[PDB]
Design a protein around this nucleic acid. Structure first.
Ligand code: EFZ
Ligand code: CA
Ligand code: CA
Lengths: 545, 404
DNA sequence: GTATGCCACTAGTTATTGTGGCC
RNA sequence: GAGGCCACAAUAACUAGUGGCAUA
């Protein structure tokens, strides 16, 4: 017989004492019939005054154990993550058995039973009602899934040992059973499995009632030799609400695991800020373009293949621009196991080599989850671009196995700063200042050749003025220039050569630096009496401090 | 033999730490190890009513390349800190840092034969995960004192000294210190006689190197130049200005005095007598052991590491920012490889000198570190660590440290 | 004078909404 | 008896530390 699992309430807690509300004569009639039958089968038992607990009958799971569940101890949680289909192996024959009487077949710990008490009220509600408690795992009780799965694992272990070659995956009340046997020998094994389970009282569909593939599971459609997602319909609307757009991003994110090149960043931008769910939101033309491409991606049918453990995994990444990356994992060319995307959701000034390295880290982690090993990468970046960036960067990384692949847009460093000051080039000392109160600011430079400039800005910050000041020095200098700033912020943005970001000032600066042929950029501490820095500081802080 | 009772603090809950995903080769290696440990009674399978969990990893052995099991008890150790430090703490000998040679010996299998208090075993639960979540996860708990729990050496301590009292009388100027699963054996003998003096101990235990005084803090060496440009002085001032948070006698006033007006970065600046004197005073402050820095046993140790390039790394050990008890360089692979060796080196130094491991500040992204650190870990402990950025001045300053 | 803000880097957390599921 | 539960994503909020700037 199946042995009970000892289960305790959380420290310091008693069981539920929730009052049962009255019900219509029709509800009581149906409950009495259901419970009379459950009592005959031994799943519940009548109780009396010795039990002080109660839980309401479920009002449209026979009983609503939300309170018992809060008071019940925690469990090691069962099926935390789901398998991803791309991690499964190809099989000749596949079967799914739904276990009919799963919870009813597992006894509940004897001293825990009293906490599951519930009452069918009388119709008059002037006379006491019929009280019961559970003898088996109740539907809806926090513990039933973990205890049932643990019982099913012990039951399956003898069978797995005699049948090493048969894959059994347990998922809720279902068993998925895969083999490489021809269908006749598979069905012989299925029936032996059914017999094994029946010795413990577990009932399953017979051959005439077993479903045939493909199997619908967790939104996937599983074939013996491939998987896909069930169809994906994007509504066509002239006007979009916030809630409509949220629905899109979820469908598109769900599609991106098998449909390559999906992009969502322009639709995500439209969800920032306050917004009631009903508010109609006007679609940007960038949103409209990206929605357009996604519609064209989803017109064509796709499928994923399963994992051949004897071949290397290969991951290939493409830049889609504006901080978006897309990837494909395969073992044989043009047969994707899965796809995905990677986006830096914060609008930071991340460098392209660095964004690519995070995509790699995201894919490496996902690949260890699904296949237990890391792939070989094919990256749109030359080995020397990668080497110069990372040996010049303060942060450590490590991508063990990758190779260049010439599919544009390639990742490349757009400019290189000098490591030594340029002889004969003008030295600019730049500076900025702003007031927090008024958002009024100034930016400017002074020069060793005697030149100087100050510009006044509105709706600005200390940070933008320091960038504005560097903008000015770049704009008004020759093709060779030395620049001295006291902002390590502005210097770090420039040394960490950003991709095209959201800030139009930063893009302008990056444009100016491409066209230059020698730029040396240097940092000095503020307020130390350093010449040049001192003169420009007096200039830009005049109408500000 | 009976078990020492163990209890968490009354409000404490047990560890519920998530298992990081493992490669298939490490999962298979761990399944073998654990079925052998279960066959010997050291661990038992557990059911779902145990909600606790502690991460488990596979690392390679020091001697062989066979796999070894590492259970990351950092969280349980924090939750039992009253037990293994106050009630049954193991004292740390200040003499150990002064031996000429110190050897590290693995006394890990000693705990395998002491039972663990039954009421505490549920807190040692761990989970061998499965690829792609295809099977529920194999759950065990400890029946014997676990390697990696700081309760184990404390409980085994009275047994440990009894084993060592003989060897201590015979060799009375040898220091034995144990931290977790390791024995630290210090001697002023020479190498050939030292390596034999440990084998006598390796037989005494079986019946039942480090050079600390070579660890030396190097001084900062400033650039010496026959001709100084505006640029050179600007760079030096920014570094010295920042470094005055370490050495309060450092000054830049006379050097800044030389940078009058809007000068070109390559213009040559002759150093006045006042400048040369400030500079010469600065060099002397730097080549002198820093003062007012003293270890505080009631405070955490902290180790910071900077990537210097070309396989070079600098590090500092401190308790308060800028008050470095120790600084050094580690020379050479990949970044993670070198960084894991640096962390183990620094932790070993820190165990010998203070009998504590430091909390590390690492210049790497967390997710990259969590993916790769076991690829090269050989130690049996795991220090606390967090992930930081490196300010440019910090790197630029410790790059000036004199090479040994 | 220890607190504030501005933004690069590093690390999170509790809530909502959505996709795909499960009671 | 106003629904919970899992993964993923987006949004909002609380952010915290380090760093140069900048306030006082
Ligand atoms: O490893 C495999 N290979 C495989 C291929 C096709 C199918 Cl349809 C099913 C499988 C299987 C499973 C499963 C559940 C996650 C749905 C099976 F258990 F074998 F059935 O797992
Ligand atoms: Ca400034
Ligand atoms: Ca200023």
């Amino acid at each position: 017989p199946i042995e009970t699992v000892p289960v305790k309430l959380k420290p310091g807690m008693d069981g539920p004492k929730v009052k049962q509300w009255p019900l219509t004569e029709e509800k009581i009639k149906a409950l009495v019939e259901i419970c009379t039958e459950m009592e005959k089968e031994g799943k519940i038992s009548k109780i009396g005054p010795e039990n002080p607990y109660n839980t309401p009958v479920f009002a449209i799971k026979l009983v609503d154990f939300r309170e018992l569940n809060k008071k019940t101890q925690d469990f090691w949680e069962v099926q935390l993550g789901i398998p991803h289909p791309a991690g499964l192996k190809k099989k000749k024959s596949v079967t799914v058995l739904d276990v009919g009487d799963a919870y009813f077949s597992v006894p509940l710990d004897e001293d825990f039973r009293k906490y599951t008490a519930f009452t069918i009220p009388s119709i008059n509600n002037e006379t006491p009602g019929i009280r019961y408690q559970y003898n088996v795992l109740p539907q809806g009780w926090k513990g039933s899934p973990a205890i049932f799965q643990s019982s099913m694992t012990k039951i399956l272990e003898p069978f797995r040992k005699q049948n090493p070659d048969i894959v059994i995956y347990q998922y809720m009340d279902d068993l998925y059973v895969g083999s490489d046997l021809e269908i006749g020998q598979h069905r012989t094994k299925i029936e032996e499995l059914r017999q094994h389970l029946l010795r413990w009282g577990l009932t399953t569909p017979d051959k005439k009632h077993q479903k045939e593939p493909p199997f619908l599971w967790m939104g996937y459609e599983l074939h013996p030799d491939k998987w896909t997602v069930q169809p994906i319909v994007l509504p066509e609307k002239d006007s979009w609400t916030v809630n409509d757009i949220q629905k899109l991003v979820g469908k598109l994110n769900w599609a991106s695991q098998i449909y390559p090149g999906i992009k969502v960043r322009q639709l995500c931008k439209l969800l920032r800020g306050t917004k009631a769910l009903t508010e109609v939101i006007p679609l940007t033309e960038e949103a409209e373009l990206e929605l357009a491409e996604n519609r064209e991606i989803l017109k064509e049918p796709v499928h994923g293949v399963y994992y051949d453990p004897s071949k290397d995994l290969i991951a290939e990444i493409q830049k889609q621009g504006q901080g978006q990356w897309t990837y494909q994992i395969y073992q044989e060319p043009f047969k994707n196991l899965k796809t995905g995307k990677y986006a830096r959701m914060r609008g930071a000034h991340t460098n392209d080599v660095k964004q690519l390295t995070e995509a790699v880290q995201k894919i490496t982690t996902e690949s260890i989850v699904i296949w237990g090993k890391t792939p070989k990468f094919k990256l749109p970046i030359q080995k020397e671009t990668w080497e110069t960036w990372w040996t010049e960067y303060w942060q450590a990384t490590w991508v063990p196995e990758w190779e260049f692949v010439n599919t544009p847009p390639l990742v490349k460093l757009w400019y290189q700063l000098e490591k030594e000051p340029i002889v004969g080039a003008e030295t600019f000392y730049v500076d900025g200042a702003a007031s927090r109160e008024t958002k009024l600011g100034k930016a400017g430079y002074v020069t060793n050749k005697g030149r100087q400039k100050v510009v006044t800005l509105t709706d600005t910050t200390n940070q933008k003025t320091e960038l504005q000041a560097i903008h000015l020095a770049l704009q008004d200098s020759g093709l060779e220039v030395n620049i001295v700033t006291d902002s390590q912020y502005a210097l770090g943005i420039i040394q960490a050569q950003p991709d095209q970001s959201e800030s139009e000032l930063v893009n302008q600066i990056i444009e100016q630096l491409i066209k230059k042929e020698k730029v040396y950029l240097a940092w000095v501490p503020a307020h130390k009496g350093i010449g040049g820095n001192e003169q420009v500081d007096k200039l830009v802080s005049a109408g500000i401090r | 033999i009976e078990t020492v009772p163990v209890k968490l603090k009354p409000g404490m809950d047990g560890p519920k730490v998530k298992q990081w995903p493992l490669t298939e080769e490490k999962i298979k290696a761990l399944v073998e190890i654990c079925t052998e440990m279960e066959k010997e009674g050291k661990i038992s399978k557990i059911g779902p009513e145990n909600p606790y969990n502690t991460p488990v990893f596979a690392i390679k052995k020091k001697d062989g390349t066979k796999w070894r099991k590492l259970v990351d008890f950092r969280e349980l150790n924090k939750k039992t800190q009253d037990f293994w430090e106050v009630q049954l703490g193991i004292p740390h000998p200040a003499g150990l840092k002064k031996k000429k040679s110190v050897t590290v010996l693995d006394v890990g299998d000693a705990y395998f034969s002491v039972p663990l208090d039954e009421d505490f075993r549920k807190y040692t639960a761990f989970t061998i995960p499965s690829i792609n979540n295809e099977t529920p996860g194999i759950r065990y708990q400890y029946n014997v004192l676990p390697q990696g729990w700081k309760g184990s050496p404390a409980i085994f301590q009275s047994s440990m000294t009894k084993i060592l009292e003989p060897f201590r009388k015979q060799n009375p100027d040898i220091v034995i210190y144990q931290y977790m699963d390791d024995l630290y054996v210090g001697s002023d003998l020479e190498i050939g006689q030292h390596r034999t003096k440990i084998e006598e101990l390796r037989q005494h235990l079986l019946r039942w190197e480090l050079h600390p005084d070579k660890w030396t803090v190097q001084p900062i060496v400033l650039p010496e130049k026959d001709s100084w440009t505006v640029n050179d002085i600007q760079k030096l001032v920014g570094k010295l200005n920042w470094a005055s948070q370490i050495y309060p006698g450092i000054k830049v006033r006379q050097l800044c005095k030389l940078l009058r007006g809007t000068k070109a970065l390559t213009e040559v600046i002759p150093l006045t007598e006042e400048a040369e004197l400030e500079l010469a005073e600065n060099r002397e402050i730097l080549k002198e052991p820093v003062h007012g820095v003293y270890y505080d046993p009631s405070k955490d140790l902290i180790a910071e590491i900077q990537k210097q390039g070309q396989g070079q790394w600098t590090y500092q050990i401190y308790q308060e920012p800028f008050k470095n008890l120790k600084t050094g360089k580690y020379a050479r692979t990949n970044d993670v490889k070198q960084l894991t060796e640096a962390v183990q080196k620094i932790t070993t130094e820190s165990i010998v000198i203070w009998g504590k491991t430091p909390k590390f500040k690492l210049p790497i992204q967390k997710e990259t570190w969590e993916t790769w650190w076991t690829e090269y870990w050989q130690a049996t402990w795991v220090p606390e660590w967090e992930f930081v950025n490196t300010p440019p001045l910090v790197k630029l300053w410790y790059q000036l440290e004199k090479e040994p």
